[PDB]
Amino acid sequence: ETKPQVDKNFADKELDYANNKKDKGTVSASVGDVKKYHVGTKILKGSDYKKLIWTDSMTKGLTFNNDIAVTLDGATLDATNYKLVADDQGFRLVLTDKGLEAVAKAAKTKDVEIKITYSATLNGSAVVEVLETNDVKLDYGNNPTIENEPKEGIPVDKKITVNKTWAVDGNEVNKADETVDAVFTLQVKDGDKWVNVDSAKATAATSFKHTFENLDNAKTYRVIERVSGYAPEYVSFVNGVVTIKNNKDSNEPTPINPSEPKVVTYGRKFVKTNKDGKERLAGATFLVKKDGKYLARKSGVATDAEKAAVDSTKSALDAAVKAYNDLTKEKQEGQDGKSALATVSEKQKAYNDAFVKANYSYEWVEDKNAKNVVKLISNDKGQFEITGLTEGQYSLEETQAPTGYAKLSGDVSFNVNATSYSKGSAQDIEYTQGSKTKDAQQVINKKVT
Numbered sequence: 237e238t239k240p241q242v243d244k245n246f247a248d249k250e251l252d253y254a255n256n257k258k259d260k261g262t263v264s265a266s267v268g269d270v271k272k273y274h275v276g277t278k279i280l281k282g283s284d285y286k287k288l289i290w291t292d293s294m295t296k297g298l299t300f301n302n303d304i305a306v307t308l309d310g311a312t313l314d315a316t317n318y319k320l321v322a323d324d325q326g327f328r329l330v331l332t333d334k335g336l337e338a339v340a341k342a343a344k345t346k347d348v349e350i351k352i353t354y355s356a357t358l359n360g361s362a363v364v365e366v367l368e369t370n371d372v373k374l375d376y377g378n379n380p381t382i383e384n385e386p387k388e389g390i391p392v393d394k395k396i397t398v399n400k401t402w403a404v405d406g407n408e409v410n411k412a413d414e415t416v417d418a419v420f421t422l423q424v425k426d427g428d429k430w431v432n433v434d435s436a437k438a439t440a441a442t443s444f445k446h447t448f449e450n451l452d453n454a455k456t457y458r459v460i461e462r463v464s465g466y467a468p469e470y471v472s473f474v475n476g477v478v479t480i481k482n483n484k485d486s487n488e489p490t491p492i493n494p495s496e497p498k499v500v501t502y503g504r505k506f507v508k509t510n511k512d513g514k515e516r517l518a519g520a521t522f523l524v525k526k527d528g529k530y531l532a533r534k535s536g537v538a539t540d541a542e543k544a545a546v547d548s549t550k551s552a553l554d555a556a557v558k559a560y561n562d563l564t565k566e567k568q569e570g571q572d573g574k575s576a577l578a579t580v581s582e583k584q585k586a587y588n589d590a591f592v593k594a595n596y597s598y599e600w601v602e603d604k605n606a607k608n609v610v611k612l613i614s615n616d617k618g619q620f621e622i623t624g625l626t627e628g629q630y631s632l633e634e635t636q637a638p639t640g641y642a643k644l645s646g647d648v649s650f651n652v653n654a655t656s657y658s659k660g661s662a663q664d665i666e667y668t669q670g671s672k673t674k675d676a677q678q679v680i681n682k683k684v685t
């Protein structure tokens with residue numbers, strides 16, 4: 237029992253080295269919320285490790301905030317003590333010779349604690365009711381090990397292909413029953429920044445290939461591997477192929493792998509209908525409100541192009557909305573209104589899609605006329621919805637009634653909880669007619685008198 241002890245949790249939850257794989261629960265959050273983490277590593281007296289490597293691999297809905305700070309027995313350990321390879325969904329932190337010696341020197345008289353703190357942002361790629369999580373592991377051992385650097389390159393015919401093999405003690409391994417945790421992240425150079433654009437996982441120690449498609453031949457990319465047990469050797473990047481060999485020494489220890497807390501976000505579906513419920517209504521427009529403030533969106537970590545698509549899709553939506561609003565009432569009540577609203581709902585979908593691709597964050601604003609405020613618009617089946625909200629009570633504030641129907645007499649309260657999106661509430665109706673799944677809150681409209 238000379239092994240390092242490692243635990244990870246949210247910063248506000250105490251570490252427990254003796255119970256480091258306990259259930260750490262699921263917490264509710266809103267998209268845009270920041271979760272703070274700490275990872276502790278206890279190195280026992282007399283340890284002389286020549287390799288200490290922490291890898292955290294996060295799910296797609298968590299953006300790693302690249303804000304690592306490291307301490308050794310409480311005192312700051314600066315960046316001369318480690319080498320960090322960060323991407324938008326995690327990192328690999330490797331102690332340098334200097335860092336390793338500092339740890340060994342400290343440990344010769346007592347147990348020492350390394351603490352690594354950082355945060356992630358819950359982003360707009362999160363899927364309602366589907367758990368998000370980080371995952372840290374510590375690779376360690378007594379032998380100096382060369383750290384190979386990821387290679388950059390370009391696509392060929394809009395493709396980059398990873399060619400992967402596995403070896404133990406220099407002997408190739410092809411074992412479909414041996415689980416591994418390798419993640420291959422494709423990043424693009426965007427200005428002075430590396431931005432994650434795609435990813436692929438290998439789940440067994442088998443010869444493996446994956447082809448990233450739809451790439452830009454004029455742009456520069458890199459593939460970064462996050463993996464434990466094995467370590468990557470970036471052999472070559474030529475002719476649109478990245479060749480990687482994973483190496484492991486059989487005499488080295490298994491990585492330490494603590495459990496992690498989970499993060500989740502929730503939603504609600506609605507259907508706008510007339511009084512008797514037999515007609516579902518398009519064009520009903522709503523703000524989303526929490527404590528008198530209004531839901532709004534901003535881009536997260538994304539490429540310039542992804543952020544620019546938010547603005548161009550918004551312009552198209554605005555134009556479609558104006559085209560409908562400028563129609564006469566008789567045209568709005570007829571075929572030209574229905575087709576115009578169909579176009580609005582198409583542009584609304586594209587705008588929402590662009591914000592999701594830009595990894596959006598929510599914010600709450602006091603001004604309901606802010607350019608970036610969320611407006612939900614009922615489609616031809618009366619449908620609209622909201623996702624990415626922490627559990628609690630909210631309201632819809634109507635900004636436009638469907639043509640020929642009266643303005644609602646007040647705000648429409650709704651509740652978000654662990655199954656509000658998938659199962660809904662007692663008095664719900666069907667989001668899609670004839671589904672036999674009553675999962676949408678009915679919002680009743682009355683005709684103008």
Ligand SMILES: [K+]
Nearest residue numbers: 371372493494
């Ligand atoms: K873990």
Ligand SMILES: [K+]
Nearest residue numbers: 659660661674
């Ligand atoms: K229900």
